[model samples]
Target chain A: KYQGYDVTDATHKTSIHNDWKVVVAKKKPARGVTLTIGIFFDGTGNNRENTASRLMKFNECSAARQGVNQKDAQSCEDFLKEINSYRGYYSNIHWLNILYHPDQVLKKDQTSAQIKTYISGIGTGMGLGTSILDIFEGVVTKTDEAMERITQALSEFMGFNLSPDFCIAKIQFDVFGFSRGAAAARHFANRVMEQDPAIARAIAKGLRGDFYDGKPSGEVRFLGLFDTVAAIGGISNFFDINGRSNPGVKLELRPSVAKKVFQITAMNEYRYNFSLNSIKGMWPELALPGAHSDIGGGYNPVGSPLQENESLFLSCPEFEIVSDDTREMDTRVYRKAEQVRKMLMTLPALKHILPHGKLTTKIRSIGVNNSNQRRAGVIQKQVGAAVFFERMAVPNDWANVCLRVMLDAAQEAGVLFEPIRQTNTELQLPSELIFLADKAIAQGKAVRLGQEPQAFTEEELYIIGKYTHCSANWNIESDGNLWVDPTTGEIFIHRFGPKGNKAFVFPNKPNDRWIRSVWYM
Target chain B: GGGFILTDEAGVPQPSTPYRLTTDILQGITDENGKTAPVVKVEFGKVK
Candidate 1:
């Protein structure tokens, strides 16, 4: 298929009209075929089993396009039941359990490196807690495996392939990734540009060109990412200190590396660990209204929870961290009101009335037993402060919006994709976000929120207001911290961090220098 | 393949605020550490 719509008639060629823009449409390779490849990279802890987007890959859903899908009822069932889906790009493969499942036992078909990666991947989902392993298997290994699949999938195309003469004049790549995989996609594109010797050699086998030593490989036509969290721990927490930054993995995409790039970052994702790799100064990024997992689509609302151990009913929650000071925030005043408001929100009665950060407390003077005076007053009643966090009644549908946006973008750029039936029946964008999503879908482009933020309208402002300043990872439970306190022989469960009372307090801030962790990491 | 040259920041929270970028050493490292440190010298730019 040609890249664009037909515009080849004599009338179109005639430049004498009132307006005629310079362009190329229906572009074929100057001589031969143009092979376009789309790669799907899942987020950290997102597996083939639990990925919400995986549902679209099946034929049962009428929304699945023609070339997509497993293609049969049993085929879809068989694919879903496979154990491979359980092991995410970061999900602990050991947790998948060879003890219970015989399929996990290394087969004779597996090679030495395959077994090493398999063993290396098992029980070491978070990348051996080292940057060396993180880069070794982290982004590179996953992209390598995914690229292998791309190589195999390439053969499925072509109207006729009897294995005689094969020549692809040009190769174009479209990559989509979520979370850490987003970092991987960007890094992968850079490697393609820099011409990783191994990668170039692998790709040259299928292409028409002769294999050169380190010439640039395939052209990255487009890179679509969802919230790049490059917590690659460069000499930091996870201790990836083999180099200054990640050795092979750097999460920057230049115009030379990728022809077009679009990213949809979550507005409300602010874990200290998930500090966003914001490319705002360089490329187009639409910080849409969602949490890290919310935009990336790991919260599976489909059938059942993937974890069989603990029963967690698949569900979605609304954004609870409401505050008034986003418009004019003074840390002193903001914390005072927020501390009380956060406490009130825990109780069912005041949860609705006492909004966050803008507290309006009604102090009524009842008769005190001691008649010191008619009334000793300390009551201030007011109503006005403003703003933020996430909502996921239909998590998959909200995620589906971005899927369609990028899918259309990739398709429009001439990347071959099994088209998706763009459905809005279950999708509901409230008055604020509806317009942005509408525009994004219409142009097959993302809606960007800039540094100045003058890019958004009054309505769109409310959508981005859902942004969290390290707040969306809010939990009010007794998140216990296990301590071998050194002074004491016994293991004590020390619990003092974001409790129901101390919620929104400074110590609760994970990035704060004096932060007390609620875990034994 | 490129280099991590010194980039930027406006640390101001609100979206409407104007950014005033500074090259002072104090702005270079941790805000906890005042913008002065031992002289570490190198030319910074993106590499090919």
Candidate 2:
């Protein structure tokens, strides 16, 4: 028996004639050597160079902020320096960024030389497949190649022999994705969890290749997603691909596979061209402020007048709020929508579609202080602190309380892994949301809409109905009874358990908003 | 770490319908505080 340590730092390298690239940094302890891998998948219309570089810069910023006096920590370099301070343990983490197909064509205005240099920098064989945003031909596309390549990378990186007998302790995977990339991450996790043992063994041998043999499987420690949009036909015909199966494309997530999944969605995103793909199992999904890119990052650049969220919605042919006469937007659409929204508030039928109450207030407040710089700040705060405890500090009139409830649930469920700041203490959901939901129940405004027979007591029904008004879904299920809400289309199962043991299964509407929420947070 | 920066029509009108941007033009528009990085902006035509 030998007791020693091993370390590996495989710097940026290409795989097999530059088909894809990987950077593996690993460490093996004498006693319990746990291996952790983090894979990041970028959104559609993104390249590995810009997307991955931005993430690294952000990570560096986060790292630099550690230990330095808060005031003295000025730039991201501080974080990078802090990371450098940890010389050995830092070697264990490996990062792999899978890029989408380089199908985005440069406009005619760009010279061929410029295009060539751009592609040369990103390199080739990184994308999953030819994913065109065109209308007719772009109908069916698959990222199977991307999954295959990631499997190969995993095999090559870890050597497929991850048993206690091989001096291996534990294997952990942390996966992240944005937009279509989120879907890819989920697909990768499903393959890891569902691969047949015999096939896995065969693949394991291939990974070892004349070396020690082992099984090719590991558990995904965490899965994080930001605004997973599985749009099929560009922005125009972009529709949710869930429940719809083509020969090759699968958009649903296997929730039972992962240890935990955390997703953040843009409550304000109303662009018809963009569709939401919900995970199949129970997971925490946070509905935050801003449009699509605002939740995901890389849309609103610093010092730019056009916030990414606004650009996403406005660029869509259907939601163009720009006036035709002036070809300019006065940023009054939200206000006008608010005015129209006030009338809707008076009318019962239209109340369901009114913009989240707090979101309108925040937008109007920002509108009052509107400037290119301040607009950038609003977008930045929403994007930067989205997954962090700092998000609790962001203003929200109605959903704030509901958001806190979700955030609390997320923390308890081990879903909030990558917060900007880790507050060791658990944050409380604002008391107002409890009062809000209870007050809504008291008002007797929770009306049952569908013809489906009721399965809940008046109190249970009221709780579900009241929360539904404020953007929360309630699904109660047990062995004996199943209660499904016709209005929100939620399936609730009732289960018997000890006293004070609660299962607050929040329900989400699937098709109401131009942006539909798929999971609970 | 570097690639291209594509431009989309937001509030600002395109200098040209199919804007032909040069390094100087991009530099001219760069923010004083913004770091120097790769610059190339490609626009996609509206799908009519």
Candidate 3:
């Protein structure tokens, strides 16, 4: 095995942990015998720590009796004895692929041809996905359904590919040391798949797991109901209207792409349960609940599927996706949802270059009716097939960063869509994006935060983008703006300068959360 | 100054203000240039 560059020897004695003798490498092996060395590192040192917490915390598997195949209660306790030690660090498993399978290394160094193939394959899978996305560049178009289909499809597929194995791996990893973060990226995909069946199939097949089964052990089942739809979709529903073609979609295996995507998948999968010291009093972690719904109480952390609400916005491309709460089109809520869709459509022209997918969007008319919650919406960019949750009232600077990263990621995947420039609570799009803004604003009394250029300043918007949603807020004034105050209905218009200074105020009409009008930047 | 409203493609008059739905101007008045003149600019040289 390619134990790593010649930096340390494998036989020096160091410590004793969980009955296994610990040794440190004095000379790095250019190549060594194939060894399955489990690495669990959390920057902490103590027997009280979980054996799996930090990379290489335990010399042998017996520390936790995990791979030792022990079943005794005492063994279990000894194994998980230090699980809480790696509280701040995230958990992850790296399938350290060794070129020389241990025995092969003792004979001689790897052949030139063998070395090339092994290194190339590993590098391509790990670096290529990110590099390819980086090459495509820019914020994605937010309303191209065709492009969105591709994006949504890709996003679901990525999540689907990392299921069960990594999901199980994550849990097992936590038993040693690492914690988790809020995996909003993949979790959002699960929510979408729950809403739409077509998406469920893509996700299920990608994960190579059946979602239709009774238990979530199947990758497809993790999305819950979509698992049932995936099962139905996987079957040859020969009842086509003309019997000309199979009515149900076929599952295509994308192992190569799946393999490449798993590098990121594994990291994010680990973050799903990796604990963070941040947040109020609790150690924060990103995790998928027992069930996730697209349009319901935003990703409720419910631990059961039977008790979950069926989201109106499905992950399926066939159904309309949106941020609005109202389900019916006749209600003022529905009208605004429609208007938001129209506005988002104009987003395609906003970006010069982006990834290769289309944009399909939905504005949930049923805005979070809860007075205490933040303003929200969803964007399913079909190209990368990624779903984005639009959260308003995020303290200014963070919003810009979040939007920039999203745009860049989409562009890398070649998904095209209009990018909205939002400052403060106001989400600004181009005027043409609105299908019927006037009507929507009227019916729902949504205050239009006009393009007050002087007051609306986000000069040289940060072009460097990364994948982080919580960073979407801008540094604009926190005093307030004319965005639909998801709180009280008193309509007001205000502006902030570059230095977070307020410029102006207007006595505008109040918007009770239904129709939150925006400006076209 | 009062705001203006425009009918949608469905021929329904849209709301003029975020809060109130005023009477529709079907025939509608137009400026000499045929463009609908501003009902009232929020400001020209002074604050309202």
Each model's TM-score? 0.47, 0.36, 0.15
- DockQ scores of all models, one per candidate: 0.01, 0.01, 0.00
Proportion of true contacts reproduced by candidate 1: 0.00
Q: Which pairs of residues collide in model 1? A: A49-A85, A131-A240, A319-A390, A323-A386, A323-A387, A324-A386, B25-B35, B26-B35
Considering summed lDDT, which 10 consecutive residues are worst modelled in model 1 chain A? A311-320
By TM-score, the better pick of 2 and 3 is 2
Best by TM-score: 1
Give the interface-residue alpha carbon RMSD of model 1. 23.1
Look at candidate 1 and tell me the lDDT of residue A215. 38
User: Which candidate order results from sorting by TM-score in descending order?
Assistant: 1, 2, 3
Q: Candidate 2 lDDT, tens digit per residue, A182-270? A: 66556656655775353344333433321221234555666666666654222121122112233333445565666767665565454
lDDT per residue (tens digit) for residues A88-158 in model 3: 11111110111111111212442211100011000012232222222111011111121233234333433
If you assessed candidate 3 against the hidden native complex, which CAPRI class would it receive? incorrect
Q: Best to worst by lDDT, what's the order? A: 1, 2, 3
After superposition on all CA atoms, what RMSD does each candidate show versus the true structure? 25.3, 27.4, 37.2
Query: Which candidate model has the greater TM-score, 1 or 2?
Result: 1
Comparing only chain A of model 1 with the true chain A, what is the TM-score?
0.50
